Short mmCIF file of C-alpha atoms in Angstrom, two decimals:
data_model
loop_
_atom_site.label_atom_id
_atom_site.label_comp_id
_atom_site.label_asym_id
_atom_site.label_seq_id
_atom_site.Cartn_x
_atom_site.Cartn_y
_atom_site.Cartn_z
CA UNK A 1 -77.03 33.41 -158.19
CA UNK A 2 -80.49 32.35 -159.47
CA UNK A 3 -83.18 34.92 -160.50
CA UNK A 4 -86.97 34.51 -161.03
CA UNK A 5 -89.37 37.20 -162.40
CA UNK A 6 -93.18 36.74 -162.74
CA UNK A 7 -94.81 39.68 -164.58
CA UNK A 8 -98.52 38.69 -164.15
CA UNK A 9 -100.64 41.93 -164.27
CA UNK A 10 -104.11 40.28 -164.58
CA UNK A 11 -106.80 42.71 -165.87
CA UNK A 12 -110.63 42.15 -165.79
CA UNK A 13 -111.46 45.93 -166.12
CA UNK A 14 -114.23 47.45 -168.29
CA UNK A 15 -115.25 50.84 -169.71
CA UNK A 16 -118.90 51.47 -170.73
CA UNK A 17 -121.32 54.22 -171.85
CA UNK A 18 -125.08 54.53 -172.58
CA UNK A 19 -126.64 57.54 -174.36
CA UNK A 20 -130.31 57.95 -175.49
CA UNK A 21 -129.39 60.48 -178.30
CA UNK A 22 -126.53 62.62 -179.70
CA UNK A 23 -127.45 65.44 -182.08
CA UNK A 24 -128.78 68.90 -182.95
CA UNK A 25 -125.14 70.14 -183.15
CA UNK A 26 -124.19 73.35 -184.97
CA UNK A 27 -120.45 74.02 -185.34
CA UNK A 28 -120.57 77.51 -186.98
CA UNK A 29 -117.27 79.48 -186.52
CA UNK A 30 -117.45 83.02 -188.03
CA UNK A 31 -114.62 82.39 -190.52
CA UNK A 32 -111.01 83.00 -189.44
CA UNK A 33 -107.71 84.44 -190.71
CA UNK A 34 -104.15 83.19 -189.98
CA UNK A 35 -101.09 85.09 -191.28
CA UNK A 36 -97.46 84.04 -190.62
CA UNK A 37 -94.45 86.06 -191.86
CA UNK A 38 -90.89 84.74 -191.38
CA UNK A 39 -87.48 84.78 -193.13
CA UNK A 40 -85.06 81.80 -193.39
CA UNK A 41 -86.24 78.64 -191.57
CA UNK A 42 -83.12 76.70 -190.64
CA UNK A 43 -84.14 73.44 -188.86
CA UNK A 44 -81.43 70.75 -188.25
CA UNK A 45 -82.19 67.67 -186.07
CA UNK A 46 -85.55 65.97 -185.11
CA UNK A 47 -87.54 69.25 -185.50
CA UNK A 48 -91.37 68.72 -185.62
CA UNK A 49 -92.46 72.21 -186.73
CA UNK A 50 -96.08 73.19 -187.53
CA UNK A 51 -96.59 76.70 -188.98
CA UNK A 52 -99.78 78.64 -189.77
CA UNK A 53 -102.40 75.83 -189.42
CA UNK A 54 -106.17 76.65 -189.19
CA UNK A 55 -108.43 73.75 -188.02
CA UNK A 56 -112.23 73.50 -187.66
CA UNK A 57 -113.16 70.08 -186.14
CA UNK A 58 -116.50 68.45 -185.13
CA UNK A 59 -115.87 65.09 -183.45
CA UNK A 60 -119.04 63.30 -182.21
CA UNK A 61 -118.27 59.63 -181.44
CA UNK A 62 -121.14 57.50 -180.05
CA UNK A 63 -118.68 55.93 -177.51
CA UNK A 64 -115.34 57.85 -177.17
CA UNK A 65 -113.82 55.24 -174.74
CA UNK A 66 -110.12 54.05 -175.15
CA UNK A 67 -108.14 50.69 -175.41
CA UNK A 68 -104.51 50.41 -176.76
CA UNK A 69 -102.05 47.73 -175.45
CA UNK A 70 -98.19 47.89 -175.57
CA UNK A 71 -96.16 44.91 -174.28
CA UNK A 72 -92.33 45.03 -174.08
CA UNK A 73 -89.68 42.71 -172.50
CA UNK A 74 -85.84 43.22 -172.60
CA UNK A 75 -83.07 40.85 -171.36
CA UNK A 76 -79.27 41.58 -171.27
CA UNK B 1 -76.44 31.60 -162.42
CA UNK B 2 -79.84 30.60 -163.92
CA UNK B 3 -82.54 33.18 -164.91
CA UNK B 4 -86.31 32.63 -165.40
CA UNK B 5 -88.84 35.23 -166.67
CA UNK B 6 -92.62 34.58 -166.95
CA UNK B 7 -94.31 37.43 -168.83
CA UNK B 8 -98.02 36.48 -168.41
CA UNK B 9 -100.09 39.76 -168.55
CA UNK B 10 -103.58 38.12 -168.78
CA UNK B 11 -106.23 40.53 -170.20
CA UNK B 12 -110.03 39.93 -170.06
CA UNK B 13 -110.85 43.68 -170.41
CA UNK B 14 -113.70 45.18 -172.48
CA UNK B 15 -114.90 48.47 -173.99
CA UNK B 16 -118.59 48.92 -174.91
CA UNK B 17 -121.03 51.69 -175.95
CA UNK B 18 -124.77 52.13 -176.76
CA UNK B 19 -126.27 55.14 -178.59
CA UNK B 20 -129.96 55.64 -179.55
CA UNK B 21 -129.18 58.08 -182.49
CA UNK B 22 -126.43 60.20 -184.13
CA UNK B 23 -127.42 63.09 -186.38
CA UNK B 24 -128.76 66.57 -187.14
CA UNK B 25 -125.11 67.78 -187.24
CA UNK B 26 -124.23 70.99 -189.10
CA UNK B 27 -120.53 71.77 -189.57
CA UNK B 28 -120.75 75.21 -191.29
CA UNK B 29 -117.53 77.32 -190.77
CA UNK B 30 -117.74 80.78 -192.45
CA UNK B 31 -114.82 80.08 -194.81
CA UNK B 32 -111.24 80.71 -193.64
CA UNK B 33 -107.96 82.21 -194.89
CA UNK B 34 -104.33 81.08 -194.31
CA UNK B 35 -101.27 83.00 -195.52
CA UNK B 36 -97.65 81.93 -194.90
CA UNK B 37 -94.68 83.98 -196.17
CA UNK B 38 -91.09 82.73 -195.72
CA UNK B 39 -87.71 82.78 -197.50
CA UNK B 40 -85.21 79.85 -197.72
CA UNK B 41 -86.32 76.65 -195.96
CA UNK B 42 -83.11 74.83 -195.01
CA UNK B 43 -84.06 71.56 -193.21
CA UNK B 44 -81.41 68.76 -192.70
CA UNK B 45 -82.12 65.67 -190.48
CA UNK B 46 -85.41 63.92 -189.41
CA UNK B 47 -87.41 67.19 -189.83
CA UNK B 48 -91.25 66.71 -189.91
CA UNK B 49 -92.39 70.19 -191.06
CA UNK B 50 -96.04 71.13 -191.82
CA UNK B 51 -96.71 74.63 -193.28
CA UNK B 52 -99.94 76.54 -194.05
CA UNK B 53 -102.55 73.73 -193.67
CA UNK B 54 -106.33 74.48 -193.56
CA UNK B 55 -108.57 71.63 -192.28
CA UNK B 56 -112.35 71.27 -191.92
CA UNK B 57 -113.21 67.83 -190.37
CA UNK B 58 -116.53 66.17 -189.36
CA UNK B 59 -115.92 62.81 -187.67
CA UNK B 60 -119.11 61.06 -186.42
CA UNK B 61 -118.42 57.36 -185.79
CA UNK B 62 -121.24 55.25 -184.25
CA UNK B 63 -118.48 53.15 -182.65
CA UNK B 64 -115.26 53.97 -184.56
CA UNK B 65 -113.26 51.97 -182.00
CA UNK B 66 -109.89 50.39 -182.74
CA UNK B 67 -107.82 47.67 -181.01
CA UNK B 68 -104.04 48.13 -181.35
CA UNK B 69 -101.68 45.58 -179.78
CA UNK B 70 -97.84 45.85 -179.93
CA UNK B 71 -95.72 42.95 -178.60
CA UNK B 72 -91.90 43.11 -178.42
CA UNK B 73 -89.24 40.81 -176.92
CA UNK B 74 -85.47 41.51 -177.02
CA UNK B 75 -82.66 39.22 -175.77
CA UNK B 76 -78.86 39.91 -175.95
CA UNK C 1 -75.94 29.62 -166.78
CA UNK C 2 -79.33 28.75 -168.35
CA UNK C 3 -81.95 31.41 -169.32
CA UNK C 4 -85.71 30.81 -169.81
CA UNK C 5 -88.30 33.32 -171.07
CA UNK C 6 -92.05 32.55 -171.24
CA UNK C 7 -93.70 35.38 -173.18
CA UNK C 8 -97.37 34.31 -172.72
CA UNK C 9 -99.58 37.49 -172.93
CA UNK C 10 -103.03 35.78 -172.96
CA UNK C 11 -105.71 38.23 -174.23
CA UNK C 12 -109.50 37.60 -174.30
CA UNK C 13 -110.36 41.36 -174.43
CA UNK C 14 -113.07 42.78 -176.75
CA UNK C 15 -114.39 46.07 -178.18
CA UNK C 16 -118.11 46.56 -179.10
CA UNK C 17 -120.58 49.32 -180.09
CA UNK C 18 -124.33 49.77 -180.88
CA UNK C 19 -126.00 52.71 -182.68
CA UNK C 20 -129.75 53.06 -183.52
CA UNK C 21 -129.28 55.60 -186.45
CA UNK C 22 -126.47 57.49 -188.25
CA UNK C 23 -127.27 60.42 -190.56
CA UNK C 24 -128.60 63.93 -191.26
CA UNK C 25 -125.01 65.33 -191.35
CA UNK C 26 -124.26 68.57 -193.21
CA UNK C 27 -120.56 69.37 -193.67
CA UNK C 28 -120.86 72.75 -195.51
CA UNK C 29 -117.74 75.03 -195.03
CA UNK C 30 -117.97 78.48 -196.74
CA UNK C 31 -115.02 77.81 -199.09
CA UNK C 32 -111.45 78.45 -197.89
CA UNK C 33 -108.17 80.01 -199.12
CA UNK C 34 -104.52 78.95 -198.58
CA UNK C 35 -101.50 80.92 -199.83
CA UNK C 36 -97.86 79.86 -199.23
CA UNK C 37 -94.86 81.89 -200.49
CA UNK C 38 -91.27 80.63 -200.03
CA UNK C 39 -87.93 80.71 -201.90
CA UNK C 40 -85.31 77.88 -202.14
CA UNK C 41 -86.24 74.60 -200.38
CA UNK C 42 -83.03 72.79 -199.34
CA UNK C 43 -83.98 69.50 -197.56
CA UNK C 44 -81.34 66.64 -197.14
CA UNK C 45 -82.03 63.62 -194.83
CA UNK C 46 -85.32 61.99 -193.60
CA UNK C 47 -87.30 65.24 -194.18
CA UNK C 48 -91.14 64.74 -194.24
CA UNK C 49 -92.35 68.21 -195.38
CA UNK C 50 -96.01 69.11 -196.16
CA UNK C 51 -96.79 72.60 -197.54
CA UNK C 52 -100.07 74.40 -198.35
CA UNK C 53 -102.67 71.57 -198.01
CA UNK C 54 -106.45 72.32 -197.87
CA UNK C 55 -108.61 69.43 -196.50
CA UNK C 56 -112.38 69.03 -196.13
CA UNK C 57 -113.15 65.57 -194.58
CA UNK C 58 -116.45 63.85 -193.62
CA UNK C 59 -115.87 60.57 -191.78
CA UNK C 60 -118.98 58.65 -190.57
CA UNK C 61 -118.40 54.92 -190.01
CA UNK C 62 -121.25 53.08 -188.19
CA UNK C 63 -118.71 50.46 -187.05
CA UNK C 64 -115.36 51.46 -188.64
CA UNK C 65 -113.57 48.68 -186.78
CA UNK C 66 -109.80 48.10 -187.02
CA UNK C 67 -107.58 45.44 -185.39
CA UNK C 68 -103.79 45.95 -185.54
CA UNK C 69 -101.36 43.38 -184.09
CA UNK C 70 -97.53 43.80 -184.24
CA UNK C 71 -95.32 40.96 -182.92
CA UNK C 72 -91.49 41.27 -182.84
CA UNK C 73 -88.72 39.05 -181.40
CA UNK C 74 -84.95 39.82 -181.49
CA UNK C 75 -82.27 37.45 -180.13
CA UNK C 76 -78.42 37.90 -180.17
CA UNK D 1 -88.30 146.50 -207.76
CA UNK D 2 -85.09 146.00 -209.81
CA UNK D 3 -82.39 143.42 -208.79
CA UNK D 4 -78.69 143.42 -209.90
CA UNK D 5 -76.30 140.50 -209.10
CA UNK D 6 -72.58 140.53 -210.01
CA UNK D 7 -70.73 137.24 -209.42
CA UNK D 8 -67.05 138.05 -210.20
CA UNK D 9 -64.87 135.48 -208.29
CA UNK D 10 -61.40 136.25 -209.80
CA UNK D 11 -58.84 133.51 -209.09
CA UNK D 12 -55.04 133.67 -209.76
CA UNK D 13 -54.07 130.81 -207.34
CA UNK D 14 -51.45 128.10 -208.00
CA UNK D 15 -50.42 124.69 -206.67
CA UNK D 16 -46.82 123.48 -207.29
CA UNK D 17 -44.30 120.73 -206.40
CA UNK D 18 -40.60 119.94 -206.98
CA UNK D 19 -39.14 116.47 -206.24
CA UNK D 20 -35.58 115.27 -207.08
CA UNK D 21 -36.56 111.50 -207.14
CA UNK D 22 -39.43 109.09 -206.30
CA UNK D 23 -38.63 105.41 -205.99
CA UNK D 24 -37.23 102.31 -204.30
CA UNK D 25 -40.81 101.44 -203.21
CA UNK D 26 -41.76 97.94 -202.05
CA UNK D 27 -45.47 97.30 -201.52
CA UNK D 28 -45.32 93.67 -200.24
CA UNK D 29 -48.45 92.69 -198.15
CA UNK D 30 -48.31 89.10 -196.73
CA UNK D 31 -51.39 87.90 -198.66
CA UNK D 32 -54.85 88.43 -197.13
CA UNK D 33 -58.17 86.62 -196.66
CA UNK D 34 -61.74 88.00 -196.74
CA UNK D 35 -64.78 85.81 -195.99
CA UNK D 36 -68.38 87.14 -196.01
CA UNK D 37 -71.41 84.99 -195.16
CA UNK D 38 -74.96 86.38 -195.51
CA UNK D 39 -78.49 85.19 -196.36
CA UNK D 40 -81.09 87.16 -198.43
CA UNK D 41 -79.91 90.62 -199.55
CA UNK D 42 -83.03 92.73 -199.99
CA UNK D 43 -82.05 96.26 -201.20
CA UNK D 44 -84.82 98.65 -202.44
CA UNK D 45 -83.99 102.31 -203.23
CA UNK D 46 -80.64 104.12 -204.05
CA UNK D 47 -78.54 101.51 -202.15
CA UNK D 48 -74.76 101.66 -202.94
CA UNK D 49 -73.62 98.38 -201.31
CA UNK D 50 -70.04 97.01 -201.50
CA UNK D 51 -69.48 93.51 -200.04
CA UNK D 52 -66.30 91.44 -199.52
CA UNK D 53 -63.84 93.70 -201.45
CA UNK D 54 -60.02 93.17 -201.05
CA UNK D 55 -57.77 95.94 -202.51
CA UNK D 56 -53.96 96.27 -202.80
CA UNK D 57 -53.10 99.71 -204.31
CA UNK D 58 -49.75 101.42 -205.09
CA UNK D 59 -50.32 105.04 -206.20
CA UNK D 60 -47.12 107.06 -206.92
CA UNK D 61 -47.93 110.24 -208.89
CA UNK D 62 -44.91 112.48 -209.72
CA UNK D 63 -47.06 115.57 -208.95
CA UNK D 64 -50.36 114.41 -207.36
CA UNK D 65 -51.65 117.99 -206.79
CA UNK D 66 -55.42 118.66 -206.66
CA UNK D 67 -57.37 121.94 -207.13
CA UNK D 68 -61.18 121.80 -206.72
CA UNK D 69 -63.52 124.81 -207.19
CA UNK D 70 -67.35 124.77 -206.96
CA UNK D 71 -69.38 127.88 -207.95
CA UNK D 72 -73.19 128.12 -207.49
CA UNK D 73 -75.58 131.10 -207.88
CA UNK D 74 -79.37 130.74 -207.22
CA UNK D 75 -82.05 133.43 -207.89
CA UNK D 76 -85.87 133.14 -207.43
CA UNK E 1 -88.88 144.96 -212.18
CA UNK E 2 -85.69 144.39 -214.21
CA UNK E 3 -83.36 141.55 -213.12
CA UNK E 4 -79.69 141.55 -214.22
CA UNK E 5 -77.24 138.70 -213.47
CA UNK E 6 -73.54 138.86 -214.44
CA UNK E 7 -72.02 135.42 -213.78
CA UNK E 8 -68.38 136.35 -214.54
CA UNK E 9 -65.96 133.92 -212.77
CA UNK E 10 -62.37 134.52 -213.96
CA UNK E 11 -59.64 131.88 -213.67
CA UNK E 12 -55.91 132.40 -214.32
CA UNK E 13 -55.00 129.48 -211.97
CA UNK E 14 -52.31 126.81 -212.54
CA UNK E 15 -51.30 123.36 -211.26
CA UNK E 16 -47.65 122.37 -211.94
CA UNK E 17 -45.01 119.72 -211.06
CA UNK E 18 -41.33 118.93 -211.68
CA UNK E 19 -39.92 115.45 -210.89
CA UNK E 20 -36.43 113.95 -211.49
CA UNK E 21 -37.49 110.24 -211.88
CA UNK E 22 -40.27 107.77 -210.99
CA UNK E 23 -39.07 104.18 -210.65
CA UNK E 24 -37.71 101.08 -208.91
CA UNK E 25 -41.34 100.39 -207.84
CA UNK E 26 -42.23 96.86 -206.74
CA UNK E 27 -45.86 95.90 -206.09
CA UNK E 28 -45.62 92.27 -204.94
CA UNK E 29 -48.64 91.26 -202.73
CA UNK E 30 -48.55 87.62 -201.48
CA UNK E 31 -51.78 86.76 -203.35
CA UNK E 32 -55.18 86.93 -201.64
CA UNK E 33 -58.44 85.01 -201.15
CA UNK E 34 -62.02 86.40 -201.29
CA UNK E 35 -65.04 84.22 -200.45
CA UNK E 36 -68.65 85.55 -200.50
CA UNK E 37 -71.65 83.30 -199.64
CA UNK E 38 -75.23 84.66 -199.92
CA UNK E 39 -78.76 83.48 -200.86
CA UNK E 40 -81.44 85.41 -202.86
CA UNK E 41 -80.38 88.91 -204.04
CA UNK E 42 -83.58 90.98 -204.36
CA UNK E 43 -82.54 94.49 -205.54
CA UNK E 44 -85.18 96.97 -206.90
CA UNK E 45 -84.59 100.71 -207.64
CA UNK E 46 -81.21 102.44 -208.42
CA UNK E 47 -79.15 99.75 -206.58
CA UNK E 48 -75.37 100.00 -207.35
CA UNK E 49 -74.14 96.71 -205.78
CA UNK E 50 -70.54 95.36 -205.96
CA UNK E 51 -69.82 91.87 -204.50
CA UNK E 52 -66.57 89.93 -203.97
CA UNK E 53 -64.05 92.08 -205.92
CA UNK E 54 -60.24 91.53 -205.64
CA UNK E 55 -58.07 94.40 -207.00
CA UNK E 56 -54.30 94.81 -207.36
CA UNK E 57 -53.48 98.29 -208.82
CA UNK E 58 -50.17 100.04 -209.64
CA UNK E 59 -50.86 103.63 -210.75
CA UNK E 60 -47.71 105.70 -211.49
CA UNK E 61 -48.48 108.87 -213.52
CA UNK E 62 -45.54 111.22 -214.34
CA UNK E 63 -47.79 114.19 -213.41
CA UNK E 64 -51.12 112.88 -212.02
CA UNK E 65 -52.29 116.46 -211.25
CA UNK E 66 -56.03 117.33 -211.19
CA UNK E 67 -58.06 120.54 -211.70
CA UNK E 68 -61.85 120.23 -211.19
CA UNK E 69 -64.16 123.24 -211.74
CA UNK E 70 -67.99 123.15 -211.40
CA UNK E 71 -70.10 126.19 -212.37
CA UNK E 72 -73.87 126.54 -211.87
CA UNK E 73 -76.43 129.33 -212.27
CA UNK E 74 -80.14 128.71 -211.50
CA UNK E 75 -82.81 131.40 -212.09
CA UNK E 76 -86.61 131.17 -211.50
CA UNK F 1 -90.29 142.51 -216.31
CA UNK F 2 -87.04 142.31 -218.35
CA UNK F 3 -84.39 139.68 -217.45
CA UNK F 4 -80.73 139.86 -218.57
CA UNK F 5 -78.38 136.92 -217.85
CA UNK F 6 -74.71 137.18 -218.83
CA UNK F 7 -72.63 134.05 -218.24
CA UNK F 8 -68.93 134.61 -219.02
CA UNK F 9 -66.60 132.03 -217.39
CA UNK F 10 -63.23 133.39 -218.62
CA UNK F 11 -60.59 130.72 -218.09
CA UNK F 12 -56.85 131.02 -218.89
CA UNK F 13 -55.76 128.22 -216.49
CA UNK F 14 -53.27 125.42 -217.22
CA UNK F 15 -52.10 122.05 -215.83
CA UNK F 16 -48.45 121.04 -216.53
CA UNK F 17 -45.82 118.43 -215.57
CA UNK F 18 -42.15 117.51 -216.20
CA UNK F 19 -40.67 114.08 -215.41
CA UNK F 20 -37.02 113.05 -216.11
CA UNK F 21 -37.67 109.21 -216.31
CA UNK F 22 -40.48 106.64 -215.84
CA UNK F 23 -39.63 102.95 -215.37
CA UNK F 24 -38.22 99.91 -213.54
CA UNK F 25 -41.76 98.95 -212.39
CA UNK F 26 -42.60 95.38 -211.25
CA UNK F 27 -46.28 94.61 -210.62
CA UNK F 28 -46.03 90.93 -209.50
CA UNK F 29 -49.07 89.82 -207.36
CA UNK F 30 -48.81 86.22 -206.03
CA UNK F 31 -51.95 85.02 -207.86
CA UNK F 32 -55.38 85.52 -206.25
CA UNK F 33 -58.67 83.66 -205.73
CA UNK F 34 -62.30 84.88 -205.80
CA UNK F 35 -65.32 82.68 -204.99
CA UNK F 36 -68.94 83.95 -204.95
CA UNK F 37 -71.95 81.70 -204.13
CA UNK F 38 -75.55 83.01 -204.38
CA UNK F 39 -79.07 81.75 -205.28
CA UNK F 40 -81.84 83.62 -207.23
CA UNK F 41 -80.85 87.12 -208.50
CA UNK F 42 -84.03 89.23 -208.86
CA UNK F 43 -83.03 92.78 -210.00
CA UNK F 44 -85.68 95.20 -211.51
CA UNK F 45 -84.89 98.93 -212.10
CA UNK F 46 -81.61 100.89 -212.77
CA UNK F 47 -79.58 98.14 -211.01
CA UNK F 48 -75.79 98.27 -211.77
CA UNK F 49 -74.58 95.00 -210.15
CA UNK F 50 -70.97 93.69 -210.40
CA UNK F 51 -70.16 90.22 -208.95
CA UNK F 52 -66.87 88.30 -208.51
CA UNK F 53 -64.43 90.51 -210.54
CA UNK F 54 -60.61 90.04 -210.20
CA UNK F 55 -58.47 92.96 -211.52
CA UNK F 56 -54.71 93.35 -211.90
CA UNK F 57 -53.93 96.86 -213.35
CA UNK F 58 -50.64 98.69 -214.18
CA UNK F 59 -51.34 102.28 -215.34
CA UNK F 60 -48.21 104.39 -216.06
CA UNK F 61 -49.12 107.45 -218.18
CA UNK F 62 -46.30 109.90 -219.07
CA UNK F 63 -48.59 112.83 -218.12
CA UNK F 64 -51.78 111.50 -216.46
CA UNK F 65 -53.05 115.04 -215.72
CA UNK F 66 -56.83 115.83 -215.74
CA UNK F 67 -58.83 119.10 -216.18
CA UNK F 68 -62.64 118.78 -215.72
CA UNK F 69 -64.93 121.75 -216.31
CA UNK F 70 -68.72 121.46 -215.82
CA UNK F 71 -70.95 124.41 -216.76
CA UNK F 72 -74.71 124.59 -216.20
CA UNK F 73 -77.29 127.37 -216.62
CA UNK F 74 -81.02 126.93 -215.80
CA UNK F 75 -83.74 129.58 -216.34
CA UNK F 76 -87.54 129.31 -215.63
#
């Protein structure tokens, strides 16, 4: 029999921010040591290993609000 | 029988930000040490290994905003 | 029977930002040390290895705007 | 004071054999298979490793007699 | 005080054999297979390694008799 | 004080054998296979490594008798 589909997700939404000032920031970690000891590493299928990483990060966006759009349609 | 699909996801959305100033930022980590010891690395299929990375990052975008749109249609 | 698809994702959305000043940033890490020891590396298929990277990054776009659009259609 | 040590181990012993015939010997093993799998071998001090040895031995001495004597004197 | 040592071992011993015949000796093993798989070999001090040996031996001495004598004196 | 050390190992011993015939020997191994796989070899001090040896031996001495005498004297 007949089939009808109407995917109509209308979107008028908004995200907003106001900030009089952003500053006087002091990211001062006291150093750091990372040590990793291992033997054979033997990975085989779709492994996403991270080993021994040390990160210092200072992220100060004026906004920091998020928009990404993914649209997908499949027919058989 | 007949089939009809109307993919009409209308989007009027918005992202906005206001910032009076961005500064006086001091990213000063006290150094850092990373050591990794291993033997044979024996990877085979779709492996995405990272080993021993050291990062210092200072990201200060006034906006830094991105619009990413992905559209896909499949028929069989 | 007949099949009809109307892929019509209308999009009037927008991204915007305002910033009165951007500066006085001091990315000053106290050096840094990375050591990696390993033996045979034995990769075979779709391996994406990184080993032993040291990064210092300072990213300060006032705008830094990016627009990415991907459109794909498959019919069989 | 004075010390006198006499070490006079007098030996007149004998080992003997008589055998009218030695023969019609058939050492016929049905083959043999040895498989050893390992990774790093990491020996350090006075190690006397044997790995994966396969021996077929036929020892037919006409006599084969053994006499072993150890003599040891210690003074301090 | 005076120290006297008289290390005077005396040895009239004998090892002897009589045999009518050695022979009709067949050493016929059905072959043999040795496989050894390994990775790094990392030996340091006084290491006496043997790996993967295959031996066929036929030892048929007419006598094959052994006399071993060890003698030691230590003074301090 | 005075030290007198007399070391008199008086030996009149003998090793002897008689054998009426030596023969009709058939050392016939059915071939043989040795495989060794390894990676880095990293030896340093007094190492006596053997790898992958194949031996076929036929030793048929008419006598084959052994006499071993070891004499040691140490004074301090």
